[PDB]
Ligand binder design. Sequence first.
Ligand SMILES: CC(=O)N1CC[C@H]2CC[C@@H](C(=O)N[C@@H](CCC(N)=O)C(=O)NC(c3ccccc3)c3ccccc3)N2C(=O)[C@@H](NC(=O)c2cc3cc(C(F)(F)P(=O)(O)O)ccc3[nH]2)C1
Length: 522
Amino acid sequence: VVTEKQQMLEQHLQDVRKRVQDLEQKMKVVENLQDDFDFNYKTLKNQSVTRQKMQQLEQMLTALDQMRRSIVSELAGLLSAMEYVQKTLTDEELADWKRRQQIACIGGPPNICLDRLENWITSLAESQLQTRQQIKKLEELQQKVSYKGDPIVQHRPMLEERIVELFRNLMKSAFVVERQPCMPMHPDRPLVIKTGVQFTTKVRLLVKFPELNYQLKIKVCIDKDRGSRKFNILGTNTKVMNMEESNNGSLSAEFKHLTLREQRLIVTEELHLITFETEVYHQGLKIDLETHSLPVVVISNICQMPNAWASILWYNMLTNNPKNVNFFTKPPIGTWDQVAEVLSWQFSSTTKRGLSIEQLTTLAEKLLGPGVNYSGCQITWAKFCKENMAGKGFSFWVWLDNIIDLVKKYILALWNEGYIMGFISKERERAILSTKPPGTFLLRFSESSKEGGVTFTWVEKDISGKTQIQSVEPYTKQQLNNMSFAEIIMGYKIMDATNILVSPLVYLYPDIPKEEAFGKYC
Ligand SMILES: CC(=O)N1CC[C@H]2CC[C@@H](C(=O)N[C@@H](CCC(N)=O)C(=O)NC(c3ccccc3)c3ccccc3)N2C(=O)[C@@H](NC(=O)c2cc3cc(C(F)(F)P(=O)(O)O)ccc3[nH]2)C1
């Protein structure tokens, strides 16, 4: 959906193109008038007819001055308009995409499409090129014909400085990281790179100039410019930028043959920047392009992956700054609503279902204790990942990451259909089951299991009539590799008072008969 701010920008660029094209027509007229004055001056050098020719030359030069004064001020007004539209395009519209990329990297909505920004940047770049050529023409014209108080002599140096500054800054802004450094075997976990593992990245120049095809050599490196680990990028660290049919004519450079090796604070919290460099030589201008990736965590073993991903989650959730390498020296605090958004993204990016309101509320209570409104609550790096949970030998994130993995690899189909209540407190599960008939059950995750465990809580009535709520010992990942959770639910039997094996499970919460819900999976 196109915004009001974006539609106003589309018209502002079209108005710039119209102004640029109007000045081109004025440039033609001023050149023809000067060419006529130059010709008539150099020629014809009854004797009072020479006095009439002199009056014609004076009138032509005064008309030349007025046309020059007009063009100069028309160009000054065009540059001011270009400056405003560029600030909206680069400092606002481009920055939003950069933030949208940070969010998409975590597991947020993938709205990071460059096609609209490439079209806007190219349009502004083509208009600025014609303007730079018009200012070059004024220099050419002045050399041939000039006079005391010439508007070109006094205002062209400023006009030239302004367009050159505009074009350089637009070229520098257009050099972006389209696809952040990521390991192909871990696509859902970018910005985490293990040493010795082949990794890919992609860069794009949003100024769609066919002149630049096969002309830009992109150099990639790591740790350019206390006691921090230094690394080197090995493999093919130079790529020539080219226009592809696959990119739809876009200038890009994809690096697929990269690896990190240590050169000759905690590892999961140490951040590094992967830098891209090139030089553009366009019609007399040397523009030095330099862009960098979002901070990367460099790991040595794949066991470090969970804690490394949490550092990326914290960074991209809390800051919009793309180069804060010292972020974890004093990490910022997050709100519950900020954290809850990220936690639901961990599930919606890997599965067809994110986290529900009830699941997020029980997750809020696990970290902050009892309450009703968690919107005014705060979660620190220590409560999330750095330190172990209260009364437990593992952190909240490690416990949660093992659940995400359990869902993704062992109980995906059940999670995707909504048969997993997942996160429900001991008090709340007893409450919602108390009303329901005997044999009603819900599926949830273990809180004491570090590696991840799945359980089912059911309700029944004793001889006395008192309602009893019990859970089964959590089924481990090893057990889920032999039998599916669905087969375990159906096959579960208990020893009755009559000493007969019976299934204590009849309806899945709220009233779904077990065979209707789990029969299709066994
Ligand atoms: C007390 C009661 O009414 N129960 C019935 C009896 C007991 C004793 C046997 C056990 C049971 O049913 N075991 C399962 C296997 C479970 C597993 N994880 O592998 C079972 O099917 N047992 C069979 C059997 C038969 C042959 C060989 C092996 C096992 C069985 C069937 C019939 C009779 C006896 C045994 N069976 C049970 O799990 C009973 N419950 C528990 O022991 C238990 C529940 C629980 C919940 C959590 C948590 F919620 F997730 P958290 O957030 O981490 O705190 C943590 C630890 C927990 N322990 C349920």
